[PDB]
Structure 1
Amino acid sequence: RCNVWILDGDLYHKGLLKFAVSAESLPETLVIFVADMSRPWTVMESLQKWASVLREHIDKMKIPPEKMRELERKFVKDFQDYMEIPVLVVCTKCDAVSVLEKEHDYRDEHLDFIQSHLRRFCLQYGAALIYTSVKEEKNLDLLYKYIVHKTYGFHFTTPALVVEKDAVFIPAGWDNEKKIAILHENFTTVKPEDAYEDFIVKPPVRKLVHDKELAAEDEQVFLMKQQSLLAKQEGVLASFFNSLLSK
């Protein structure tokens, strides 16, 4: 049985992480990072937020530098040895892509943009990317198999799927900048180096802006003001009718 630890989204509870991972239990732990595809625009901001939180957590652990470099060597050896600590990025509510086509006029270029961003981030952290949909039950068994493989060392056989928009799967080591360059061919307006935020926009949700506080004047200032007061006492039609007048 594999221990499961779900941290609340607020940083106020991030200090609970010390009770989820310890020095003895760090190598046995597999890290899962969730990305919400119903809110794609915050995905990388959230990912650098939580990854940075994990880096800060590992900093407070005070692992010996030799042991830390040993862990890095083990992880990288697992990395380059791939043929056709661990970090796995899981995308949730990818079926909301169907919403993005109808509500925000997205297209294959935008989806290529976000997934190329996600694969470059996975390269940065050496992670495996996967797309899921609990609503549609997509890639759940593929997930479970990969999780068991990477934790218990079980076998794995599924290949990398990078053609379908909402079912992408990339095991660790598969991705590379040359392999990521295929999506940049589909780009016709944006570039790989363009900023996330300028192209993909965070919608300005029409929150109820509470009205200005209307305040009654104080009695003294009001009476002073009253004392001061008391003591001192069509075209388009014309265009058409000009058009039919010139001729």
Structure 2
Amino acid sequence: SSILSEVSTRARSKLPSGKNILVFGEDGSGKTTLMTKLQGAEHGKKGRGLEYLYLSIHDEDRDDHTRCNVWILDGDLYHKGLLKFAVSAESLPETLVIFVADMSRPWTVMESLQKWASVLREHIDKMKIPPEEMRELERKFMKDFQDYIEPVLVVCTKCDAVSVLEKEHDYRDEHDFIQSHLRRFCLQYGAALIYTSVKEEKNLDLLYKYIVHKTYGFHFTTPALVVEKEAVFIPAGWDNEKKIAILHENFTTVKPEDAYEDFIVKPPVRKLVHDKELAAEDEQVFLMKQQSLLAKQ
């Protein structure tokens, strides 16, 4: 035994399967579709609550395989308690957090992102980690931050809807506003931004490479792109307020301090405004009305 145990402690081990990805976003933001596509599956059955899956990761050079746990939460907070089932104390460092930003509904991007970021914050509050462990994790994360040279990951979905925004809502290059706001939010939370389009198959391989890099520690070489309007990619540590200032030059009616809701408006969708409930007058009330009519005569 002692023998077998000692042999075991020398195992060439597989890459860590325990690794976890947590995905957040509003319903209909494309969370499930995005992850299913990354998995290589054609059809993902839509779940309400805490959705599940895993990525098969293959290293061709070593001819080795490993698999990343996948967990995507439902948009409704009614299913929030499932997060304790997605991330635990032991599995928290192995977990990579993915937040979905819906570019088909840009006006709810920031608000939903603060919704998702907050919910994660209360979750880690409930987790009750030791303060020393929390400081150690923050040290590791910030060490990864400044050591970047040329974790939370923000992925933008259905960016091709920008083409609709140019037509349906008369958007232009200035409405720079949303991406500057998103980059400032990333700086606030130290996240990496990437733009994606499953419809156009944009940056899917770049996304997959970056996920494998951040989780398994694999290599990564693609540079930061911030010029293309709907293909912006910013790895962690690249963004800065001075670097964000390039977009503020292109503004001509708005200012960087201007509110998101004022410049970008939530459209009042023309739902079927239901008519007033018409109800037959009761016999008593109708007859009191008739009494009032007769008495005055």
The Cα shift of 1:223 comes to: 1.9
Identity of aligned residues (%): 98
Return the alpha-carbon distance in structure 2 between the equivalents of residues 217 and 113 of structure 1: 55
SS at match of 1:2: strand
Q: Distance in 1 between matches of 2:246 and 2:126?
A: 40
Name the structure 2 match of 1:209: 273
When the two chains are superposed, the root-mean-square deviation of aligned CA atoms in Å is: 0.8
Q: CA deviation at 1:48?
A: 0.5
* Match among 131, 137, 147 for residue 81 of structure 1: 147
Give the aligned partner of residue 63 of structure 2: none
Any idea what SS the aligned residue of 1:3 has? strand
- 1:45 is displaced (CA, Å) by 0.2
Partner of 2:108: 42
Q: Describe the superposition over 1:69-89 as per-residue Cα deviations: whole angstroms up to 9, x where unpaired.
A: 0000000000000001x0000
Aligned residues: 231
Alpha-carbon deviation of 1:167? 0.3
Q: CA–CA distance in 1 between the matches of 2:70 and 2:208?
A: 13
Mapped partners of 1:228, 1:201: distance in 2: 51
Give the distance between the partners of 1:231 and 1:151, measured in 2 at CA.
Answer: 85
Describe the superposition over 1:46-102 as per-residue Cα deviations: whole angstroms up to 9, x where unpaired: 011000000100001111000000000000000000001x00000000000000000
Cα distance in 2, alignment partners of residues 115 and 224 from structure 1: 64
Write the distance in 2 (CA, Å) between the matches of 1:99 and 1:183: 22
1:231 deviates by 4.5
Bigger fraction of residues in strand: 2
- Measured after TM superposition, the shift of residue 201 of structure 1 is 0.3
- Give the Å deviation of 1:232: 4.1
- Per-residue CA deviations over 1:128-172 (Å, capped at 9, x if unaligned) read 000000000000000000000000000000000000000000000
Q: How many angstroms does 1:217 deviate by?
A: 1.4
Q: Deviations over 1:111-131 (max 9, x none)?
A: x00000000000000000000
C-alpha distance in 1 between matches for 2:289 and 2:232: 71
Q: Which runs of 5+ in 1 are unaligned?
A: 234-247
CA deviations over 1:16-44 (Å, ceiling 9, x no partner): 00000000000000000000000000101
Q: 1:194 to 1:232 in 2, by over 3 A?
A: closer
* Greater Cα radius of gyration, structure 1 or 2: 1
Q: Distance in 2 between matches of 1:124 and 1:4?
A: 25
| C-alpha distance in 2 between matches for 1:120 and 1:225 | 64
Q: Quote the Cα distance in structure 1 between the aligned partners of 2:233 and 2:172.
A: 20
Per the alignment, residue 106 of structure 1 pairs with: 171
Q: Return the offset for 1:227.
A: 3.2
Shift in Å at residue 215 of structure 1?
1.7
Contiguous gaps of at least 5 residues in structure 2: 1-66
- Cα 1:154/1:222, change in 2 over 3 Å: same
Higher relative contact order (CA 8 A, sep 6+): 1
**Going by fraction, where is helix more abundant, 1 or 2?**
1
Cα distance in 1, alignment partners of residues 296 and 186 from structure 2: 76
Separation of aligned partners in 2, 1:151 and 1:49: 25
